[PDB]
Amino acid sequence: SDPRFPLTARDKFSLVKSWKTFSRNLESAGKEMLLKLFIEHPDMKDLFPKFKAKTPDQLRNDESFEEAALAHITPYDQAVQDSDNVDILLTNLKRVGRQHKTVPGFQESYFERMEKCLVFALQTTLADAYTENMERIYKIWISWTTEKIREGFRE
Numbered sequence: 001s002d003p004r005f006p007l008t009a010r011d012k013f014s015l016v017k018s019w020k021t022f023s024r025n026l027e028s029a030g031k032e033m034l035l036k037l038f039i040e041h042p043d044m045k046d047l048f049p050k051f052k053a054k055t056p057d058q059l060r061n062d063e064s065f066e067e068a069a070l071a072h073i074t075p076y077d078q079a080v081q082d083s084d085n086v087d088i089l090l091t092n093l094k095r096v097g098r099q100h101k102t103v104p105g106f107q108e109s110y111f112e113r114m115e116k117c118l119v120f121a122l123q124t125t126l127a128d129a130y131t132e133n134m135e136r137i138y139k140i141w142i143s144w145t146t147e148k149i150r151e152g153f154r155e
């Protein structure tokens, strides 16, 4: 255990076990997240010009969409993998933030929008396994990751 990491040892184990289940179909989860983002905030689709005028069905098999979906889920999965190496976890999350600095139209306030989308994918995929306890833990951990991503953006 490392006190820089937000979760207690018990909560960290709950995260790792739950995520192991969720991670079975990571690319699908990423696709779900981006499609949810575009529902909640249609103007976010405009930040990805390669997707213009394409329906969710046309996107699901699209190569550029597959790439973007993987880019949006991968750092969360890499973060869980690195739960016991905070120094590396911090390097990786701050890099994600730094990578949005020059995205046209991007604002720091947008990172938090991805949180609800990840939560949506977690709820939908885990179904009854998304317990009240897991909801609590995911809210803490997802919030903490966003803060680190934002730090990287502000560097």
Ligand code: HEM
Residues within 6 Å of the ligand: 037, 044, 047, 048, 067, 068, 071, 072, 073, 075, 076, 096, 099, 100, 103, 110, 111, 112, 113, 114, 149
């Ligand atoms: C709603 C907020 C966000 C929007 C609108 C957004 C949009 C984008 C766009 C347009 C790009 C560059 C084009 C592309 O690769 O498709 C990008 C890159 C990326 N985003 Fe996001 N992003 C958001 C938040 C996040 C979050 C929360 C993560 C991970 C936790 C993430 C991970 C990445 C990664 C890994 C890249 C690739 C960076 C690179 O290869 O240089 N993004 N994002």
